Each structure stands twice: as structure tokens, then as C-alpha cells.
Amino acid sequence: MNLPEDAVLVDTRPRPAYEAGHLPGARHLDLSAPKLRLREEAELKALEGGLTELFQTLGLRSPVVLYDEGLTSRLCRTAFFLGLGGLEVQLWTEGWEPYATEKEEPKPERTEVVAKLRRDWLLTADEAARHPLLLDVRSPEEFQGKVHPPCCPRGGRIPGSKNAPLELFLSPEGLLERLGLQPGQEVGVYCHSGARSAVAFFVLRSLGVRARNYLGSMHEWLQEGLPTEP
Numbered sequence: 001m002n003l004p005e006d007a008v009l010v011d012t013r014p015r016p017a018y019e020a021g022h023l024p025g026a027r028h029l030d031l032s033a034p035k036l037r038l039r040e041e042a043e044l045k046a047l048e049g050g051l052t053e054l055f056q057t058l059g060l061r062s063p064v065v066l067y068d069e070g071l072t073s074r075l076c077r078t079a080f081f082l083g084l085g086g087l088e089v090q091l092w093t094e095g096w097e098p099y100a101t102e103k104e105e106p107k108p109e110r111t112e113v114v115a116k117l118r119r120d121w122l123l124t125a126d127e128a129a130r131h132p133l134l135l136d137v138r139s140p141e142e143f144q145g146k147v148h149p150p151c152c153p154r155g156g157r158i159p160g161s162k163n164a165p166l167e168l169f170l171s172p173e174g175l176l177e178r179l180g181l182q183p184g185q186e187v188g189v190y191c192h193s194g195a196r197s198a199v200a201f202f203v204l205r206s207l208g209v210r211a212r213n214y215l216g217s218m219h220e221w222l223q224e225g226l227p228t229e230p
């Protein structure tokens with residue numbers, strides 16, 4: 001993979017791996033999946049302000065190249081938030097390893113970049129509720145409501161959603177065909193709390209699909225008391 005000029009590098013691996021050696025100048029950022037509630041404009045503006053503080057503290061600016069060992073959930077989750085904030089991002093999953101030589105962590109000066117939410121990358125609960133096609137990337141047992149995590153009130157799925165377990169997205173060849181999709185089509189993706197839905201989002205976008213990521217996912221849906229199946 002070729003790199004764009006003057007790129008800022010972000011390493012999404014766990015800290016010990018980062019400290020054992022990272023690309024010169026790369027910042028460490030391995031974001032966990034927050035449980036977000038995005039219903040009011042003020043909540044969307046708070047997510048945005050949080051990304052601004054993050055971007056400035058890490059000295060980020062476009063273009064950003066994020067790297068990790070393979071297409072990991074943390075790489076995708078982290079890259080999704082940076083791109084969601086308006087930064088131009090790219091994922092680098094192989095080929096950077098020979099350059100992971102730096103042990104010292106950079107202490108860049110803050111930048112003054114300001115995040116601006118990219119609404120076409122996102123789905124709020126209300127937008128997801130009106131979406132023509134949502135893909136639930138959890139396991140079939142979760143999709144069928146047979147099991148659920150203890151932080152949620154019951155097992156279930158968003159009504160009308162279709163199950164596309166995450167593992168399917170690791171085999172892009174013929175994926176759209178198998179999922180019954182085509183380039184340009186509007187598709188939403190979700191899971192429990194947006195932890196791994198970004199993997200499906202990036203894979204689908206790379207295939208030309210207008211994918212949108214419902215970060216709130218099942219957890220927000222259930223906390224809101226929205227309609228569910230079974």
C-alpha cells in the first residue's frame with residue numbers, strides 16, 4: 001500500500017505491542033466501544049466535541065493512516081471514529097511491520113483541527129428505525145433472541161433486520177452477491193454496542209455499498225424501549 005503525503009500515523013494495537021516498536025511518529029490509539037445514546041442534537045454535538053478534543057490532543061490532521069496486524073475490530077472501530085469526525089482515513093493491514101522500529105512515544109503539539117460529524121457514515125436510532133435494510137452482524141443465536149448479554153433486558157433483534165454474521169465480511173470475494181446486495185445500495189449495520197460493526201462498514205464501503213454504522217446498536221435500541229423481535 002502506498003501512503004499519502006504528510007500522513008499522520010495511528011497505531012491501533014494494544015499498548016505493549018506499540019511500546020515494543022511502532023512506526024516513527026505514530027500515535028497510539030486503541031479505542032474501546034463506547035455505549036452511545038444519540039437521540040438529541042446535543043448528544044450528537046457532544047460526540048463531536050469529544051472527537052475534537054481527541055484529535056487535537058493527538059495532533060491529528062488529514063490524511064491519517066491507521067495500521068494494525070490484519071483487519072482487526074479495534075482498527076476498524078478506531079478508524080471509524082476518526083473518519084466519523086471528518087478526518088480522511090485509510091486502513092493499512094499489512095506491509096508496515098518492517099517499519100515498526102520506534103520505541104519512544106511522540107509528544108506532538110496539539111493541533112487545532114475541529115471534528116465535524118460525517119452523518120452519511122452514521123445511523124442514529126431514529127435513522128436506523130427508518131432504514132430500508134439493516135444487517136445485524138451478531139451471531140444467529142443473538143439475532144434469534146436466544147441469548148443476550150446481562151447489560152441488556154432481553155434477547156432480540158431490530159424488526160425486519162437480516163442476519164449477516166460478522167465472519168462473513170472477512171471473505172469479500174462474491175460477498176455482495178451472497179448477501180443479495182449491489183454497489184450504490186443503502187445498507188445499515190449493527191450489533192450490540194457498535195464494537196465490531198465498523199468491520200462490516202469498511203468492508204461494504206470498499207465494495208461500493210453505501211453502508212451506514214448504527215453505533216447505538218442493540219444496546220441503545222433496548223435501553224430506549226424501541227420495538228424488537230421475537
Ligand SMILES: [Zn+2]
Pocket residue numbers: 149150151152192218219
Ligand atoms: Zn447491552
